[PDB]
Coordinates of C-alpha atoms and ligand atoms in Angstrom, one line a residue:
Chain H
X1 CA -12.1 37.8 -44.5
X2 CA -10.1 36.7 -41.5
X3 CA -12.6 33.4 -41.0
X4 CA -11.4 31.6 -44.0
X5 CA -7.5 32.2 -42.9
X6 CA -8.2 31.2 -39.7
X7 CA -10.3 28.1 -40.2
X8 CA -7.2 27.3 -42.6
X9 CA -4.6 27.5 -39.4
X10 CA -7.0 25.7 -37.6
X11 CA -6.7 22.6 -39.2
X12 CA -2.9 23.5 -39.5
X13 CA -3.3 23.4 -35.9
X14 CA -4.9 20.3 -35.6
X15 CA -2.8 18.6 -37.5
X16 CA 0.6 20.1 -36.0
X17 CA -1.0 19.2 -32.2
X18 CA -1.5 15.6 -33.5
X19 CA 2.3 14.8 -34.7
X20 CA 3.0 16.5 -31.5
X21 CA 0.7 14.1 -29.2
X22 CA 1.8 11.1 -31.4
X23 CA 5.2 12.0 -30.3
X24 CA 4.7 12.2 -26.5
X25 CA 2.7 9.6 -26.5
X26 CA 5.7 7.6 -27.9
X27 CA 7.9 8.5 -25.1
X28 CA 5.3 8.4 -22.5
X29 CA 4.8 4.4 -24.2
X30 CA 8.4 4.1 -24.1
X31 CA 9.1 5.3 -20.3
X32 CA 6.0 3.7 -19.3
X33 CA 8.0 0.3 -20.9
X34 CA 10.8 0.7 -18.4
X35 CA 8.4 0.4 -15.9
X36 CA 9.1 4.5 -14.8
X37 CA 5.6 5.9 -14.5
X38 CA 4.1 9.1 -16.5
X39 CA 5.6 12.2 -15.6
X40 CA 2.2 14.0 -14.5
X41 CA 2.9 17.4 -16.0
X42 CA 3.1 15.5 -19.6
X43 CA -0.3 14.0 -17.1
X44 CA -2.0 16.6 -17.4
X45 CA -1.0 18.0 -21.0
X46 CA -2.3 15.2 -22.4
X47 CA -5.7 15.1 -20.6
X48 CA -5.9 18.5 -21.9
X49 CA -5.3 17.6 -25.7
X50 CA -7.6 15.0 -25.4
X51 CA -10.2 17.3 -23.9
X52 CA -9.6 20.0 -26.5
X53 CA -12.5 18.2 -28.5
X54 CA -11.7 20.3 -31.7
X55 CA -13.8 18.3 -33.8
X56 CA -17.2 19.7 -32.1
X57 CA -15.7 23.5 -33.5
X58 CA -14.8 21.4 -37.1
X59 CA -18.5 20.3 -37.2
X60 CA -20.0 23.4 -35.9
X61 CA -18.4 24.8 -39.1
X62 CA -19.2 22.4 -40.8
X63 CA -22.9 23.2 -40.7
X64 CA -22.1 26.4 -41.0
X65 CA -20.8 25.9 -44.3
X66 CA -24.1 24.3 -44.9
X67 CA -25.6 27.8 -44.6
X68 CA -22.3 29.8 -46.1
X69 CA -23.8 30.4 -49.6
X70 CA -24.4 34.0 -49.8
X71 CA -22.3 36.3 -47.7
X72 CA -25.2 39.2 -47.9
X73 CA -28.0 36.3 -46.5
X74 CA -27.3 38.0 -42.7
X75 CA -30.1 35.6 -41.3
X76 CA -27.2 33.6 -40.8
X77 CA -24.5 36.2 -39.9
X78 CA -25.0 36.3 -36.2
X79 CA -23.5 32.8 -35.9
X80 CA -20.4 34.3 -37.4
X81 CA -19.5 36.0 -33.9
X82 CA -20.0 32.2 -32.1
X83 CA -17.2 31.3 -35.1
X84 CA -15.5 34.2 -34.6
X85 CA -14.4 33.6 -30.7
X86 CA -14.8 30.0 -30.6
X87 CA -12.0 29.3 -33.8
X88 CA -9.9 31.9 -32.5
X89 CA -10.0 30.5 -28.9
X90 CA -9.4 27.1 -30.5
X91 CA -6.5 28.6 -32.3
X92 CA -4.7 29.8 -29.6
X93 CA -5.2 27.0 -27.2
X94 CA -3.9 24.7 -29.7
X95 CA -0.8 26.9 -29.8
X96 CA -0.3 27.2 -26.1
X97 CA -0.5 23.4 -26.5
X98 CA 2.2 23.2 -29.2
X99 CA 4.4 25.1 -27.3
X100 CA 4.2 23.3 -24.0
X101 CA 4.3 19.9 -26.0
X102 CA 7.5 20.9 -27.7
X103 CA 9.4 21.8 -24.6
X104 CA 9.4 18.5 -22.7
X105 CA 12.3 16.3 -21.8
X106 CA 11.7 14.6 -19.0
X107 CA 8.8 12.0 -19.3
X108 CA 8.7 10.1 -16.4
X109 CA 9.9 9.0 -13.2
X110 CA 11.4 6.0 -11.1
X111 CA 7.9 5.1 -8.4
X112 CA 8.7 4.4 -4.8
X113 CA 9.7 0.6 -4.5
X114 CA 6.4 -0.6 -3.0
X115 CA 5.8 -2.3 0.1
X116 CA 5.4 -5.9 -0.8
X117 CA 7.3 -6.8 -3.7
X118 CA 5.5 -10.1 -5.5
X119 CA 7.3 -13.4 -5.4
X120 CA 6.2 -16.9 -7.2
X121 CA 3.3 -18.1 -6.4
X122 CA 3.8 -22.3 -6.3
X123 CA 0.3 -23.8 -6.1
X124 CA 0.8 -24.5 -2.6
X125 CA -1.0 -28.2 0.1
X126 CA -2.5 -27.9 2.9
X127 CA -0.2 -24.9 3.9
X128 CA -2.9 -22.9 5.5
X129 CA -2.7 -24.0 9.3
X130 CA 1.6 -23.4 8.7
X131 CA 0.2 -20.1 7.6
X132 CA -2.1 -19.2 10.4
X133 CA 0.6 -19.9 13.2
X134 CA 3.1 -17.9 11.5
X135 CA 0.6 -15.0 11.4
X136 CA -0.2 -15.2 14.8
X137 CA 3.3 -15.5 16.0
X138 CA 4.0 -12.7 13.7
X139 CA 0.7 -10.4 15.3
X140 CA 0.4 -11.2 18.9
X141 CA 4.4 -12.2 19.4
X142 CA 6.2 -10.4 21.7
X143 CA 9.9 -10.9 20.3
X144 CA 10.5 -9.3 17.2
X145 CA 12.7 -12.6 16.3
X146 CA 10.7 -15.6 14.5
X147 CA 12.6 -18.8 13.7
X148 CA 11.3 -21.0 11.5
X149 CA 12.7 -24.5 11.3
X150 CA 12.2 -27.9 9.3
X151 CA 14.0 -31.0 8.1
X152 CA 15.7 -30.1 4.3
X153 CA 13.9 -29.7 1.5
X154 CA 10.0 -29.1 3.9
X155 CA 8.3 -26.1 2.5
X156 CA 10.3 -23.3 4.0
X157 CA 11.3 -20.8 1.8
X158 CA 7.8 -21.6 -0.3
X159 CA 6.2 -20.6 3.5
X160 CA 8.5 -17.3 2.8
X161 CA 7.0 -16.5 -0.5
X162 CA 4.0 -17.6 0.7
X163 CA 3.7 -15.2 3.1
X164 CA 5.3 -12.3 1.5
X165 CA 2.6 -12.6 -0.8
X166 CA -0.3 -12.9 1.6
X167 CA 1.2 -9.5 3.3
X168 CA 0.0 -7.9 0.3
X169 CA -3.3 -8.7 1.0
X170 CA -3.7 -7.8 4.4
X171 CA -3.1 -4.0 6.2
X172 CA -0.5 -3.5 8.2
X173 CA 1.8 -0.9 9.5
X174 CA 4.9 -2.1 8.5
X175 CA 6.6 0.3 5.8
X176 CA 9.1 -2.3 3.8
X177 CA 9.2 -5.6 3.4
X178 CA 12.7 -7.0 2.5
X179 CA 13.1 -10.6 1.2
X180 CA 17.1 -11.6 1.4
X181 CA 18.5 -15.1 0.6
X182 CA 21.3 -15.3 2.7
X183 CA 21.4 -19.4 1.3
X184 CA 23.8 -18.1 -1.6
X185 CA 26.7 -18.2 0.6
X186 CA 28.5 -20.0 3.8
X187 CA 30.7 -17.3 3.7
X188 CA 28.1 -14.6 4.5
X189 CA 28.5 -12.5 1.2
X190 CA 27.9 -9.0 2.6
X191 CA 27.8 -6.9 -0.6
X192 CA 25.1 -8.8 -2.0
X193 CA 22.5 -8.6 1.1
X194 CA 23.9 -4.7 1.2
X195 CA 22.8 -4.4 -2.3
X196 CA 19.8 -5.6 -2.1
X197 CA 19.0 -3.9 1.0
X198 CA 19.8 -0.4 -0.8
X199 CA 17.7 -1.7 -3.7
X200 CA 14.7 -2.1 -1.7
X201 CA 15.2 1.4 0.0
X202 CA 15.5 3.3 -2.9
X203 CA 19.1 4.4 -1.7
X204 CA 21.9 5.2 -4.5
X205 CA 24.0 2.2 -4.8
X206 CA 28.0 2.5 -4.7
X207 CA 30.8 0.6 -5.7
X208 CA 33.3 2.3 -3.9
X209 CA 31.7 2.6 -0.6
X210 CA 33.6 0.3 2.2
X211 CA 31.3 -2.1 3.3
X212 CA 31.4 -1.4 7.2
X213 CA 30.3 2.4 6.5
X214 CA 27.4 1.3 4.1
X215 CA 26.4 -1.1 7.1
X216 CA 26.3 1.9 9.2
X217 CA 24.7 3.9 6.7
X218 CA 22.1 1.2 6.1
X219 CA 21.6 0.5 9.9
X220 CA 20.6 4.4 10.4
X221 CA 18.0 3.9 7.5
X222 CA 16.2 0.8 8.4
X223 CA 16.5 2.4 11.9
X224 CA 13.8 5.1 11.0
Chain G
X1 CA 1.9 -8.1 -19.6
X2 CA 0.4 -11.2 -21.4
X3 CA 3.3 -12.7 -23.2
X4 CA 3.7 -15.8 -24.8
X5 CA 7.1 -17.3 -24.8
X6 CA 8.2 -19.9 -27.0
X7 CA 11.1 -21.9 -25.4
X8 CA 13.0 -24.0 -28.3
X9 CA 14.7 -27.2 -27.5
X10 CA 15.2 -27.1 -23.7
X11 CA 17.6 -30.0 -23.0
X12 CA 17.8 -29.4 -18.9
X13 CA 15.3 -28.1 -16.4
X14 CA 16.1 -24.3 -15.5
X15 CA 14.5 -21.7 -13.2
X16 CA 12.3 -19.6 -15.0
X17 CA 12.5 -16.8 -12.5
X18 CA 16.4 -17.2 -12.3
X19 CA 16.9 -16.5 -16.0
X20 CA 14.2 -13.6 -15.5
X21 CA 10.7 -15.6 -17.2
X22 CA 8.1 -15.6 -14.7
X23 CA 6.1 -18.7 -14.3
X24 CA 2.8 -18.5 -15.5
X25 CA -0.5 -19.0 -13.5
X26 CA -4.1 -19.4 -13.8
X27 CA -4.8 -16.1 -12.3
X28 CA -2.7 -14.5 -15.4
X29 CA -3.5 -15.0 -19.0
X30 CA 0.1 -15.3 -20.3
X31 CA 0.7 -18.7 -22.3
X32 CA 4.4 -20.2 -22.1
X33 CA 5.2 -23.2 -24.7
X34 CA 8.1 -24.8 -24.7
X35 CA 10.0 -27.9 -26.8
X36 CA 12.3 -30.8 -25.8
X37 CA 13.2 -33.8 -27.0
X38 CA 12.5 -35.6 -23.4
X39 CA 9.1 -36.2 -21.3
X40 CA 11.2 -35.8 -18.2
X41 CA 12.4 -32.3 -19.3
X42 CA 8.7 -31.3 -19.9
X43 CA 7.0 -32.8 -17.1
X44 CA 9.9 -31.0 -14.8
X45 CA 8.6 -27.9 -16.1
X46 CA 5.4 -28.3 -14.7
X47 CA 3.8 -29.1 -18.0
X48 CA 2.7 -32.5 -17.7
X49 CA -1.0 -32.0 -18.8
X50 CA -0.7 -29.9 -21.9
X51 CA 1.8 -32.3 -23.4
X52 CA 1.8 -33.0 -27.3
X53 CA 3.8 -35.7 -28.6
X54 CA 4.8 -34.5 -32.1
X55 CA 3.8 -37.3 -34.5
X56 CA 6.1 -38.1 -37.5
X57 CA 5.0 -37.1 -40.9
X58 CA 2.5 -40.0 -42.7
X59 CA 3.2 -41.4 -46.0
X60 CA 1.2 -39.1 -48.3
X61 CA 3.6 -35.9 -46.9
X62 CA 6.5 -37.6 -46.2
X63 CA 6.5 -38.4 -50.4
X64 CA 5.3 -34.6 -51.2
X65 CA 8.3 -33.4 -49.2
X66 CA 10.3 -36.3 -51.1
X67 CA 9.7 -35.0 -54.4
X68 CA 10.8 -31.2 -53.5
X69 CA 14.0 -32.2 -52.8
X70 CA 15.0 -33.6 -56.2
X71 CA 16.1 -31.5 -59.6
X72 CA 13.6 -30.7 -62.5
X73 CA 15.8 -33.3 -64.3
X74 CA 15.4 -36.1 -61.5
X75 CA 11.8 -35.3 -60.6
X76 CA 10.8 -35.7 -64.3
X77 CA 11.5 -39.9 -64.3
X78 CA 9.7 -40.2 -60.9
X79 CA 6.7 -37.6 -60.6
X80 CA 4.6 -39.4 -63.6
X81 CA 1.4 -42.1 -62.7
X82 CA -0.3 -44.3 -64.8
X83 CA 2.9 -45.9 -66.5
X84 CA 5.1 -47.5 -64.1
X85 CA 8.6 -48.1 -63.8
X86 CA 10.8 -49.1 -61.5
Chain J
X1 CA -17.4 37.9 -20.0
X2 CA -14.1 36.9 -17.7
X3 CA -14.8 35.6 -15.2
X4 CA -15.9 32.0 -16.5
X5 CA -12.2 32.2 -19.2
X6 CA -10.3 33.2 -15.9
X7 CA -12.0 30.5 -13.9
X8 CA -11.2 27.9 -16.8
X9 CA -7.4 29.5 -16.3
X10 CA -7.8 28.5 -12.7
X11 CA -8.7 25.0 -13.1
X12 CA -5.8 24.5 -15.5
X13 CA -4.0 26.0 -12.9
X14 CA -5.1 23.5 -10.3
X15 CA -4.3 20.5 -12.4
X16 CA -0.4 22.0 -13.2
X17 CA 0.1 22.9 -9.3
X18 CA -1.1 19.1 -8.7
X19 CA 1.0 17.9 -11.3
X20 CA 4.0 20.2 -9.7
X21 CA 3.6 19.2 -6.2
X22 CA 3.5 15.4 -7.4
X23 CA 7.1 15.9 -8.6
X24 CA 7.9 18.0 -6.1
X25 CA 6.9 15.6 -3.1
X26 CA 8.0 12.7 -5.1
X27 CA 11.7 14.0 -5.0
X28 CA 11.5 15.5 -1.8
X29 CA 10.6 11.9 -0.5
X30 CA 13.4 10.6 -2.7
X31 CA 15.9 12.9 -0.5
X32 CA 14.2 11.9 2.7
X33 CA 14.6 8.4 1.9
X34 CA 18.7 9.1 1.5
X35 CA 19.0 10.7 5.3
X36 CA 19.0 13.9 3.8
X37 CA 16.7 16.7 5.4
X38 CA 14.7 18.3 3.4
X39 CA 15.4 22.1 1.6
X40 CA 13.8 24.2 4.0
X41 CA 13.2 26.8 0.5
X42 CA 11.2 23.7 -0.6
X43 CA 10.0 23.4 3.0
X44 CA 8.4 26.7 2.7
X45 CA 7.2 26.4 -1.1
X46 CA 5.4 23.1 -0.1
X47 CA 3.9 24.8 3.1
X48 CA 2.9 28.1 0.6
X49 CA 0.9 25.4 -1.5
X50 CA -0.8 23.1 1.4
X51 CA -2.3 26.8 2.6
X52 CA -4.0 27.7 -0.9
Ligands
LIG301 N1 2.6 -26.7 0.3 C1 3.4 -27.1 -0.7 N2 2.7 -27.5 -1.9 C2 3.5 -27.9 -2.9 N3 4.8 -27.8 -3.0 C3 5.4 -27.4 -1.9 C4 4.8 -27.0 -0.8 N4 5.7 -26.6 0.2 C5 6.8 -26.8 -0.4 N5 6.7 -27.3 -1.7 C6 7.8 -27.5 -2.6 O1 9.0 -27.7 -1.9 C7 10.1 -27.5 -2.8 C8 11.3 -27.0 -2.0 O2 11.0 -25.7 -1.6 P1 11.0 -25.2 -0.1 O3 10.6 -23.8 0.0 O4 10.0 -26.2 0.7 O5 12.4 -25.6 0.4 P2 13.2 -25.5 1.8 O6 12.7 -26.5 2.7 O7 13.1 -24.1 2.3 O8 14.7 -25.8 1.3 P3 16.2 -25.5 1.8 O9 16.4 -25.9 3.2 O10 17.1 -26.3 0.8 O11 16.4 -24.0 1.6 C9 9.6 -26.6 -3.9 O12 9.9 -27.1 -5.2 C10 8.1 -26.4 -3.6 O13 7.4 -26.6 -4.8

């Protein structure tokens, strides 16, 4: 009787496939912590352990076991074919899962930097009209250079934030939006700004590299 | 994520964001408490109506946490009512 | 009966060659975003899987 044996490495299965998902779902927790998203093959492994539904096949037994009193009683015998296939397919689609669980390494990946990276958000007064002629400036003006002036101390670098964060909102077809602080320095610190333009380009950063061929290398990339 | 952050004994106001904490706002449900021995260090850090003014201890504790400070031997000639000595 | 098991296989297949692509595009991009032109082997396997 190959039913009994089978149903046996069934649960064997079942239990094998859920130490396995605990485990990837402990990396996939862990990557997902540093911010890297899901790999989507370990994606799409998992949405097809959590389909496997193997406890619909454990109850169908289940009520067959109900009936599974007499062996020679074949009123209830043709069911054993719908067993038959249905444990056996459950067996071996379990197993394909094992084996795929087992093999992965990599669990996810670094996303694209996005397009507006979030900045504080200071309860902001009567900023709104400040707001609306920077946005037109910035829409209808025809110079790609906006100044933006004020005595010390008068709401300029909040009107930056402010308006980096409103670009989120709004569509537009501008690809990256870079926010530098070039206040740190009166000496123009160079490998800061470079650094934090390669950061928000997903470039490779290097230590090594002279500065004035990074400039050039950077001034090709914004370029495109 | 909704974090709460317990600050202990902030003795100068600091950037949150510079350290790497960011500031919390009504449109996120994170909760950040912090402690100092100064108003002006609190109210610089934006916290000027959810301030609690931490109360000394009254009487009745202030003698319960007296007594557990003392030696069986010691606690013995001072614990007892009803009789009184000196 | 297999046609509806090899049309199962199929939709499994679907959801992998997603999953692949993603990767696939996502470090493709990554180069892209370096100055560097894109493999033109991985040129053709992308253009192979955009005609399925
Ligand atoms: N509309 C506003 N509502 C509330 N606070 C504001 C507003 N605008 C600016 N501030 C406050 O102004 C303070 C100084 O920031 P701000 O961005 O205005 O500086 P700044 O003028 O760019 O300074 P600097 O010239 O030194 O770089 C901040 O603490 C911020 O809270």
């Amino acid at each position: 009787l190959h039913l009994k044996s089978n149903w046996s490495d069934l649960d064997k299965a079942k239990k094998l496939l859920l130490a396995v998902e605990t485990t990837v779902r402990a990396r996939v927790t862990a990557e997902v912590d540093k911010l890297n998203i899901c790999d989507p093959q370990v994606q799409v492994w998992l949405r097809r352990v959590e389909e496997l539904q193997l406890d619909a096949i454990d109850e169908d037994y289940s009520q067959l076991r109900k009936y599974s009193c007499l062996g020679q009683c074949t009123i209830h015998a043709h069911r054993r074919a719908s067993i038959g296939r249905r444990v056996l397919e459950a067996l071996d689609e379990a197993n394909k899962l094992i084996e795929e669980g087992r093999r992965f390494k990599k669990f996810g990946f670094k996303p694209l930097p996005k397009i507006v990276d979030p900045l504080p958000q200071i309860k902001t007064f009567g900023l709104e009209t400040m707001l609306s002629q920077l946005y037109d400036l910035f829409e209808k003006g025809d110079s790609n250079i906006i100044g933006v002036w004020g005595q010390g101390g008068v709401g300029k670098t909040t009107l930056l934030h402010v308006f980096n964060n409103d670009l989120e909102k709004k569509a537009h077809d501008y690809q990256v939006v870079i926010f530098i602080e070039v206040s740190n320095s009166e000496a123009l610190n160079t490998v800061e700004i470079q650094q934090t333009i390669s950061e928000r380009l997903n470039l490779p950063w290097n230590d090594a590299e002279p500065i004035a061929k990074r400039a050039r290398f950077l001034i090709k990339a914004l370029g495109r | 994520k909704r974090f709460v952050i317990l600050l202990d004994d902030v003795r100068k106001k600091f950037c949150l964001e510079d350290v790497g904490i960011p500031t919390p706002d009504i449109n996120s449900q994170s909760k950040l408490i912090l402690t100092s021995r100064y108003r002006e260090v609190c109210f610089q850090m934006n916290a000027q109506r959810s301030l609690i003014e931490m109360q000394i201890l009254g009487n009745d504790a202030s003698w319960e946490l007296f007594l557990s400070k003392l030696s069986t031997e010691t606690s013995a000639a001072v614990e007892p009512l009803g009789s009184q000595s000196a």
